[PDB]
């Protein structure tokens, strides 16, 4: 669905 | 197959002077810009992390821009570490610099676009949040709106204008995943500087390298351990130098024989920045 996202 | 003789900074230097060390990848974080004035990490934030989350920002952008006006540095001077990476570029050793930072200090230090993976974007350009408009605005327009304390709005949509930073909850640029697929099959050395490897998917980058590839951490604290193996009996390739990044890069440059080069580079480039 989307590219990997910025996560803490 | 341990390519390092000793698990020390000097061992990393000796390995870098050998013919096996041709392609070096740098993974850098906020720690390499703290000595430049860039900081590391009322409005009723539901949680303090929402200041950098895209959903909250789209709902309530005022806290972020207030913080931006508060923490906007008066000057942008790259540090000794940035110029160490610049020396790596000038000597044909730098395959890529993956940065978590948004201060563009790698560009100002002289790293070109092909050298860089700005994994979390940049503050330099900004865009309208409407995907059917995407009107682009420069850092001058953004800085004027930030210091006049007027929320940036698009001249075509009247929508919110956001700096091209990857907020928490946004996807990383496609260039990240394009470079990663090729860069880590060939990497001879990982230089991890100024990051505690706390933000994904950036941190996972340290596990993409081959198992024989040495990895040196220059950071105020050990990080990336399960994975980083510094202090076990099976340790064979991971070195940790704890302290300020500028000090670690000074020491590594001197051990490599580049002390005077790095000194001259820093002096001349800082003079050129103060001149303009
Ligand atoms: C998941 C992607 N991501 C982004 C970040 C960094 C979050 C902090 C952003 C700081 C903004 C500073 C505004 C002022 C800048 C002046 C040049 N981590 N992970
Ligand atoms: Zn627009």
Numbering used by the authors:
A (entry chain C): 396 to 403
B (entry chain A): 56 to 96, 109 to 293, 306 to 355
Study text:
SIRTs catalyze lysine deacylation through a distinctive mechanism in which the amide oxygen of the acylated lysine transiently attacks the C1’ of the nicotinamide riboside residue from NAD+ (hereafter referred to as C1’ of NAD+ ribose), forming a covalent ADP‐ribosylated intermediate. Here, we report a new class of mechanism‐based 1,2,3‐triazole inhibitors that hijack SIRT catalysis by forming stalled triazolium– or triazole–ADP‐ribose (ADPR) adducts derived from the cofactor NAD+. These trapped adducts inhibit the enzyme without covalent protein modification, prompting us to term the compounds “Sirtuin Trapping Ligands” (SirTraps).
Compounds OTi‐1 (3, ornithine‐triazolyl inhibitor 1) and LTi‐1 (4, lysine‐triazolyl inhibitor 1) mimic acetylated lysine (Kac), whereas OTDi‐1 (5, ornithine‐triazolyl‐dodecyl inhibitor 1) and LTDi‐1 (6, lysine‐triazolyl‐dodecyl inhibitor 1) mimic Kmyr through their dodecyl extensions, engaging the full acyl‐lysine channel. To elucidate the molecular basis of this unexpected mode of inhibition, co‐crystallization experiments were performed with SIRT2 and compounds 5 and 6, both in the absence and presence of NAD⁺. In contrast, significant melting temperature shifts were observed for 5 and 6 at 10 µM, further enhanced by NAD+ addition (ΔT m: 5 = 9.9 ± 0.0 °C, 6 = 16.3 ± 0.1 °C), indicating strong SIRT2 stabilization. While NAD+ preincubation also improved the affinity of compound 5 (IC50 = 0.76 ± 0.25 µM), its potency remained > 200‐fold lower than for 6.
